[PDB]
Amino acid sequence: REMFAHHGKAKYDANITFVSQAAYDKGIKEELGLERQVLPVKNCRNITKKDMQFNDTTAHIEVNPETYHVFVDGKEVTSKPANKVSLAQLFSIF
Amino acid sequence: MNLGFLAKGNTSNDASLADQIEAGAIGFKIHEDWGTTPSAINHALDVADKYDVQVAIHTDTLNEAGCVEDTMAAIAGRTMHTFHTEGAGGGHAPD
Amino acid sequence: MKKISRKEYVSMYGPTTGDKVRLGDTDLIAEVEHDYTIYGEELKFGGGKTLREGMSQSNNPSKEELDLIITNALIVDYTGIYKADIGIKDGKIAGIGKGGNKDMQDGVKNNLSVGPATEALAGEGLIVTAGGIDTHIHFISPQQIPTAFASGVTTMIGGGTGPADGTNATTITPGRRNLKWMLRAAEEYSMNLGFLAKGNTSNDASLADQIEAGAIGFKIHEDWGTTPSAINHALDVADKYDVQVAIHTDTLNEAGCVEDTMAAIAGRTMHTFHTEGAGGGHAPDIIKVAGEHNILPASTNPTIPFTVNTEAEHMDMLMVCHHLDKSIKEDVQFADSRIRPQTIAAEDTLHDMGIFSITSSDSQAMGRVGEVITRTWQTADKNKKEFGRLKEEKGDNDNFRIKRYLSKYTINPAIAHGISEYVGSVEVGKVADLVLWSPAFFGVKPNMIIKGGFIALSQMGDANASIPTPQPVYYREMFAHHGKAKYDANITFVSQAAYDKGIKEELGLERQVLPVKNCRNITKKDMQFNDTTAHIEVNPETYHVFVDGKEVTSKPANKVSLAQLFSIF
Amino acid sequence: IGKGGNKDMQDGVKNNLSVGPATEALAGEGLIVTAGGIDTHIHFISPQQIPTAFASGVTTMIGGGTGPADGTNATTITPGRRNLKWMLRAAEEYSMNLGFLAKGNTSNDASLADQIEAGAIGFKIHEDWGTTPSAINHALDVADKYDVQVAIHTDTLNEAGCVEDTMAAIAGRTMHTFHTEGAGGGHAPDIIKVAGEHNILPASTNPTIPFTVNTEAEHMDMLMVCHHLDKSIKEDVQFADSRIRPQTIAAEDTLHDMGIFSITSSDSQAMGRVGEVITRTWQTA
Amino acid sequence: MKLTPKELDKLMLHYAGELARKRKEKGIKLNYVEAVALISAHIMEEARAGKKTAAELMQEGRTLLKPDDVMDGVASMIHEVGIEAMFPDGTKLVTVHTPIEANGKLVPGELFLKNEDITINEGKKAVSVKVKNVGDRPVQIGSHFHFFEVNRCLDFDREKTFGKRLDIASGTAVRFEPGEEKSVELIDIGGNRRIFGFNALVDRQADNESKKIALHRAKERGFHGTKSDDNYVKTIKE
Amino acid sequence: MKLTPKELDKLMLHYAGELARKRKEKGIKLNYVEAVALISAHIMEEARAGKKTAAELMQEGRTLLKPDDVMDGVASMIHEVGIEAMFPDGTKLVTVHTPIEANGKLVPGELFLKNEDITINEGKKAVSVKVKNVGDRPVQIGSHFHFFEVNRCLDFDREKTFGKRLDIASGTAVRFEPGEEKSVELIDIGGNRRIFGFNALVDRQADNESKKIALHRAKERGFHGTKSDDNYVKTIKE
Numbered sequence A: 001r002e003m004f005a006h007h008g009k010a011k012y013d014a015n016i017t018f019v020s021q022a023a024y025d026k027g028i029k030e031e032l033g034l035e036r037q038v039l040p041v042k043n044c045r046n047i048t049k050k051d052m053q054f055n056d057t058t059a060h061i062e063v064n065p066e067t068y069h070v071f072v073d074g075k076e077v078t079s080k081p082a083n084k085v086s087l088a089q090l091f092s093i094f
Numbered sequence B: 001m002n003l004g005f006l007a008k009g010n011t012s013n014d015a016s017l018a019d020q021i022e023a024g025a026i027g028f029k030i031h032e033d034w035g036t037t038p039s040a041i042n043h044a045l046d047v048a049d050k051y052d053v054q055v056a057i058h059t060d061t062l063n064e065a066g067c068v069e070d071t072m073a074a075i076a077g078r079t080m081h082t083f084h085t086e087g088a089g090g091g092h093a094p095d
Numbered sequence C: 001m002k003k004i005s006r007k008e009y010v011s012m013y014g015p016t017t018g019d020k021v022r023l024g025d026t027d028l029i030a031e032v033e034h035d036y037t038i039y040g041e042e043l044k045f046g047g048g049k050t051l052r053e054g055m056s057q058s059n060n061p062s063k064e065e066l067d068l069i070i071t072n073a074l075i076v077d078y079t080g081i082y083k084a085d086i087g088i089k090d091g092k093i094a095g096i097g098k099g100g101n102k103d104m105q106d107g108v109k110n111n112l113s114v115g116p117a118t119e120a121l122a123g124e125g126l127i128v129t130a131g132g133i134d135t136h137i138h139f140i141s142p143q144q145i146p147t148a149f150a151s152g153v154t155t156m157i158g159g160g161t162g163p164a165d166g167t168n169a170t171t172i173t174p175g176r177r178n179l180k181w182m183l184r185a186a187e188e189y190s191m192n193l194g195f196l197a198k199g200n201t202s203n204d205a206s207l208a209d210q211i212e213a214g215a216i217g218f219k220i221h222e223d224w225g226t227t228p229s230a231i232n233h234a235l236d237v238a239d240k241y242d243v244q245v246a247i248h249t250d251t252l253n254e255a256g257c258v259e260d261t262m263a264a265i266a267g268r269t270m271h272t273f274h275t276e277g278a279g280g281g282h283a284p285d286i287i288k289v290a291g292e293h294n295i296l297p298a299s300t301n302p303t304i305p306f307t308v309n310t311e312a313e314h315m316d317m318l319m320v321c322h323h324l325d326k327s328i329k330e331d332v333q334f335a336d337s338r339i340r341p342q343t344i345a346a347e348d349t350l351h352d353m354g355i356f357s358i359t360s361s362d363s364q365a366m367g368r369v370g371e372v373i374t375r376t377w378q379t380a381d382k383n384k385k386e387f388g389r390l391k392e393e394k395g396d397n398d399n400f401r402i403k404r405y406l407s408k409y410t411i412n413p414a415i416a417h418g419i420s421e422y423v424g425s426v427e428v429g430k431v432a433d434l435v436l437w438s439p440a441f442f443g444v445k446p447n448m449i450i451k452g453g454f455i456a457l458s459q460m461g462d463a464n465a466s467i468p469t470p471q472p473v474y475y476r477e478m479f480a481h482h483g484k485a486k487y488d489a490n491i492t493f494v495s496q497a498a499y500d501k502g503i504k505e506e507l508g509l510e511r512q513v514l515p516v517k518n519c520r521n522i523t524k525k526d527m528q529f530n531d532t533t534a535h536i537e538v539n540p541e542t543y544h545v546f547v548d549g550k551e552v553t554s555k556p557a558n559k560v561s562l563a564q565l566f567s568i569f
Numbered sequence D: 001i002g003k004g005g006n007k008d009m010q011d012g013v014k015n016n017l018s019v020g021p022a023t024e025a026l027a028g029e030g031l032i033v034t035a036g037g038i039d040t041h042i043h044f045i046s047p048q049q050i051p052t053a054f055a056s057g058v059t060t061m062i063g064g065g066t067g068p069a070d071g072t073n074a075t076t077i078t079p080g081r082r083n084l085k086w087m088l089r090a091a092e093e094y095s096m097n098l099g100f101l102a103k104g105n106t107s108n109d110a111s112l113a114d115q116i117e118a119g120a121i122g123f124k125i126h127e128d129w130g131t132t133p134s135a136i137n138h139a140l141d142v143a144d145k146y147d148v149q150v151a152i153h154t155d156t157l158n159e160a161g162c163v164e165d166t167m168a169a170i171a172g173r174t175m176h177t178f179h180t181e182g183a184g185g186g187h188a189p190d191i192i193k194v195a196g197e198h199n200i201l202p203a204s205t206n207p208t209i210p211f212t213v214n215t216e217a218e219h220m221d222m223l224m225v226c227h228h229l230d231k232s233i234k235e236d237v238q239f240a241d242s243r244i245r246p247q248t249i250a251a252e253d254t255l256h257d258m259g260i261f262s263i264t265s266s267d268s269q270a271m272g273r274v275g276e277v278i279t280r281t282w283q284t285a
Numbered sequence E, F: 001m002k003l004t005p006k007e008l009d010k011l012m013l014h015y016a017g018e019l020a021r022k023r024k025e026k027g028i029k030l031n032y033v034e035a036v037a038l039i040s041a042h043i044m045e046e047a048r049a050g051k052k053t054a055a056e057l058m059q060e061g062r063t064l065l066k067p068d069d070v071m072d073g074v075a076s077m078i079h080e081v082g083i084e085a086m087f088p089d090g091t092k093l094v095t096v097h098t099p100i101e102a103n104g105k106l107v108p109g110e111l112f113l114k115n116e117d118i119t120i121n122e123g124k125k126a127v128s129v130k131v132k133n134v135g136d137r138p139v140q141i142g143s144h145f146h147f148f149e150v151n152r153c154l155d156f157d158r159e160k161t162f163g164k165r166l167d168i169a170s171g172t173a174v175r176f177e178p179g180e181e182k183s184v185e186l187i188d189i190g191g192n193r194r195i196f197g198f199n200a201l202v203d204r205q206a207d208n209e210s211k212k213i214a215l216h217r218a219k220e221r222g223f224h225g226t227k228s229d230d231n232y233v234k235t236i237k238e
């Protein structure tokens, strides 16, 4: 159920609308009459795969054009399908 | 909910690309149903370099204008976020 | 991978983890505890070096790009002794760590990004500390301020109105109009400043109006009358306005003894000036309050270190100022109860035990404004020569003693006067008031002063020369000292109540104006590395000093370090 | 500029030279009047340079820096909007016309343009921040759009190319060259050949003029101190002998007398003397 | 007189040196300030006299103070003394190197180092490349320069050096005389491996796709030792 | 050198003293400024030499100038000369008391006084009270302190001292050693007789009604010699 931060004018103070830096500098919040917090995004262009935390592996990947097998640095990579998963039927009625 | 919106990246008109960013978008999506060609990829990345926003892509499944290496040549080493990279949701068949 | 010998590594980049350095001409040895660098990716500036475009200066920098970076610095602070690069942005310390260009180097975070807007300063082989804070200034002459600045002090707290007789005795700026005079005069100087008001009254409305006029606290001084009534009223008002109180107690025991003063204080927080008692206080036993929980005790510099010329000099100073005569038996009896070489000898050992926690000047009023840091390190060196290496040390170094004595003039006075969120240490988010030292000259003569993120003072040769090094070299004002730039680089501290009523706009001040806070909820346990409490007794006849039953004393010295090797006068 | 006086009593007095009750008088009989000097190679290392230059007859100083930091000790550069704000607000102290140069050593066009909008009158490109052909090209492109000047200290080590590669990067556009003889820095050994070109405005700094019998030894010992060289290493000796070159130093005075060099300057407290530009010019003449 | 500020500063320096000389005549061991002042004042007077060159004064400044004339620790603190003085041919800079030998054990600011070596660029494997300078002018290359884009008169197999830099101590350099040939050690550039500038041969992310473009650009601009095949296929953005 | 402003000021003082010494060698009688400078410079040089204590220099400063060496009037103008100097144990203050004896009759700023005494506190009749210090620490009392509210270790008949102060010269004091007993003279406080502060025993108008409250308060806080009767009756405001 919804609590008190979901309601009234309190929800304006508790939520953020993200925009570009250029729209933020031209005053988009005042022009459109927005009451939420408005903040700019930044540092989008100088990041690579090495900036991802704990998942930063680079490799050479090849796909066979006929059998569709996948190779990572020469080694074949696959897995087996599962007939049962956790966190599913124990917890939900539907 | 905190929210942010993506604009249309499938065009070769630089002025149309720039006006969407000034109107409040945080980035572009390039999708094959609006036409993912190397020209549109190149123009969208050029504008996003100037405005410091991110680009996301759904690539050409039908290989209509080129294959995966042609898309990578259009990207030309610049930063890109790829959606559903396995390819069941869309992308260059089969690789 | 390559192997580089330790000697040439240190000659290129300064000492690293495990290496040791002697501080000045003393016997104190500091050891590097940790290093943030990645070996092979060091920052160097010059022709053919690494700080060039596309290599360590980024062509695609972060949006938090630095204004200035200090490379390969050895930081000496109460938080530790370690090697790092220091980044400055918008007058604040923005980052402490590795620094460089993420496009070409591995471990560079966003707050240490080097770009086209960045200036470089080479710190290899040098020591960086925080600026000193002096809390016992008599504002007798404006020429004290450049003297303190050249010794490495960047904040001065005290009171006065110039060379009047009230200021010559007491650190007091009395009343709203005199506070307005001093606050408007303060716009001249390259120093953070704060002013104390008159606490010697029993009128609550007069006490409160001075705090609203801009003062950061009260001084209670015996020449304006230190009675238990005035102590009680001043502490009551200071509880309501969140400001500090300092006291010079009743030497003559006119209204009561030391326990009556402590009863008037009634467990509330108090800063005590010159607690040994040579500068004033209950004869002969004011030094016993330094064991108490609610007292923040301080000593002034002319009694430290204890030397063979100390007693005669102080006796002749006492005879001049009080106009005493040796032919009168009451002037002789007064003088012999004042000076007391027993407590003076005990003071050095009490500093070494962490029972005294703050050092200060008492400037031009029995004390020397350019010698606080030097006399602190002289006392540390004398105590190491007499009592040996401390038992709290880990390893073959003196790092614990170095932190204990460094805290006495940097972080502890900042905590005591409620400005430790702004100044006092080298930490991320604080004001960039920093001092650069060569290790051969540590503690006596610095290289340069950075004030508010820009260089304000440095050693400098003659202006017509082809390089800044040739003779004569002396301390000269830099660009942060001049024009309208000095308004952006300096801070005037006021009370929270004066800040909220708009004192900056009312008096037309152009400096930064910031409020003090958290002055009333601190005790002796909040002092870094000097937090010892004990039971202290003074014999009423022989004036011997006992700490938990054990007698405490020291020997006078005939020679000190950091004195005649370094100065022509 | 003319006769001056009172038309009621004297013949040839025009309206713009009328002397009246609001006029003050200054006697110039037997004296010489010149314009104030203009020094364009200032390292802003210490504020005490300014009264020294003022007493020698210089009334405008153009350069860059932030005080005694290591970047300013080498280069005439005030980098970035915030540091430009610091220096412009400090400039209100002094009795001197002033102008500041920004950092030109980058390939980011937006970073170059923001410094010009923050108040700089031009760029300096210096080899200690990296003088590559890419940075030269980008800086000249931005300076064409904003109508400001570019100054250069070229690559002494020939790391990315020789002098003709630098001239190819310049590509016929206007450039001011500092210490073009090359004792203060530049392509070893032939940076002096650019002083014959049409698009180059060439300048010399004062410690090499006039050429005296103490010049070579003094400059050699200055080079050994600043680079921390050792005479026992064959590569430091080979580097030093390719740097100083008394042949080009001797040629510099004659090139000044022929009108091939056109500007003199100081290089103040960075191998040069801020109170001696005018004096060394007349000594050379 | 029309004194300048320089003249006033030098007058003060002269009388500081005179005080140091009087104290030396009374038998007092000089401190740091006194020794520096004495050497500076002596050099200025000798240059005013006009009978000696600057190079002779550089050697004469080393004989003024014996090791027994100064306090313990002074000689280790004074590495050099510089002073400008006016000769008959004008103002010159005179630097006196190591004027006093030491005789005691006190070294202020002394360093106590461990004896273990430092390993730089750990985990980076190096390769070896032979390089020849076929030009007529010397070339010197720093530690973090992109070695693929060095001066076109250096001849080497440029394909093997893409994305690499010299494996030397940071801030040092390697020198090539005209006609000189030697081998160097190269390691991979770290970080994001985004290469911008240097000769504008890459200006993008370094990878195998960008290597072909860089080799074609280097061959068209005449960089020695670059081998890119004929019938090159252009991309949409080069 | 890294000179401080203190070093520059002391260098100027040294050469002022040197000029005074040269003028004394030429046979010129020294004036006020010259004599002060000569004594200060001599003390600074002796402290630099390091063979004498500060107390010895305080006596050595009194032998430098004979009475015939100075102009008439100099010796009466110089009461003391102070100078700070750096010893081997650091900076110390040396004060030289009455360095020159006088030999002439000229006294600048001379006072010519009448010989009649001054009567202070006219019209105030004094009473005499015996006071004993039964504590272990010395006590000193000023001229305008409310004598009823002095240190509780002093024992005297406190009822007779309400509203009174010492009948001595304004700004002087009376001292009590431990165990000492003596008599003092007391007179009534003037003005509006509103007593605020001092130990907060009155804090109101002084009269016979406020004396009872003050005596009760003094007895409860243990002031010696206070006699207030049992079965005290409180008022509405105490």
Ligand SMILES: Cc1cc(C)cc(-n2ccnc2SCC(=O)NO)c1
Binding pocket: C169, C170, C248, C278, C279, C280, C314, C317, C318, C321, C322, C362, C365, C366
């Ligand atoms: C020991 C001493 C030294 C000096 C310079 C003055 C005094 N002196 C004179 C009158 N009252 C005092 S004590 C106040 C003080 O020196 N700081 O608060 C005592």
Ligand SMILES: Cc1cc(C)cc(-n2ccnc2SCC(=O)NO)c1
Binding pocket: C047, C466, C467, D074, D075, D153, D183, D184, D185, D219, D222, D223, D226, D227, D267, D270, D271
């Ligand atoms: C010949 C010389 C003299 C001096 C004082 C410095 C250098 N020196 C050191 C490192 N880099 C340089 S050259 C930069 C310059 O002096 N002006 O731009 C060379």
Ligand code: NI
Binding pocket: B058, B083, B084, B089, B090
């Ligand atoms: Ni999709």
Ligand code: NI
Binding pocket: C248, C273, C274, C279, C280
């Ligand atoms: Ni005091």
Ligand code: NI
Binding pocket: C136, C138, C169, C170, C171, C362, C365
């Ligand atoms: Ni004081």
Ligand code: NI
Binding pocket: D153, D178, D179, D184, D185
């Ligand atoms: Ni240059």
Ligand code: NI
Binding pocket: D041, D043, D074, D075, D076, D267, D270
């Ligand atoms: Ni220069």
